[PDB]
């Protein structure tokens, strides 16, 4: 039977491209975010700590608070609001 683990069916959700494999840009890991700012969840597979679910990969979260290094995001999953803790390595700002 199939499993129910957190990494289930994440062969390409949590995979890095060939020319971004290895160390990531360190400037992405100290990008400070403001209160209420909209940020995109684009999970960095190399950074194995503070990662959200693969189910939130590609969702825009509204920053509502900080819990140390990571940020608190109000993410939408279908019809429910979720609080998704993610470090700045996995987040990316939305530009207008």
């Amino acid at each position: 039977t199939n499993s129910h683990g957190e990494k289930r069916c994440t062969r390409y959700k949590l995979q890095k491209t060939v020319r971004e494999r290895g160390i990531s840009p360190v400037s992405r890991a100290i990008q400070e975010f403001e209160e209420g700012q909209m940020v995109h969840i684009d999970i960095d597979p190399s950074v194995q700590k503070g990662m959200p679910n693969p189910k939130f990969q590609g969702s825009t979260g509204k920053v509502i608070g900080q819990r140390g290094r990571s940020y608190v995001l109000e993410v939408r999953s279908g019809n429910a609001m979720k609080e998704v803790f993610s470090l700045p390595q996995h987040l990316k700002p939305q530009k207008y």
Binding site: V18, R19, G22, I23, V26, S27, A29, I30, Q31, R69
Partner: protein
Amino acid sequence: MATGPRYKVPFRRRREGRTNYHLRLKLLLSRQDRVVVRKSSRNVQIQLIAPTPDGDITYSSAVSNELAKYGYTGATGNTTAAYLTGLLFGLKSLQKGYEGGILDIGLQASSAGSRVYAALKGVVDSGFEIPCSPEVFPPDERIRGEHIAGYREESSDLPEQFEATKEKIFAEFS
């Protein structure tokens, strides 16, 4: 040798052997200015750096080429010159409005009584705040330049000129 399209070249600083990015990620998590001390074979240089996504920016700096104007004549690439450069950097950064910062020796190896730790002791003695342990500090006679008697008698001008430069720079910035 980028043999094909599945070749991941290192980053440019890592290709040039000039920056470690794991150490850079460790240091940038502090959210504090870095005392980027770099030593050249003929003199020494110290910077205060704060990163922004456009690139690093440097607030204050000080090299061994400035020690001439304060009355220094000896070698600019020894422990005494490193201490004087660190003291000048600390006083200048205090004057500009910076009093904190974590040490950053980068790729240079860590060993007690080096020129980098001499510059660190110079920065600490100027009132600049930087977390450090006194074990890696050099002895006071080494900062004075008490190596002189081994090889050369023309090195004997070092301690008196170091004390003169110290008092001159302290009067200059305070």
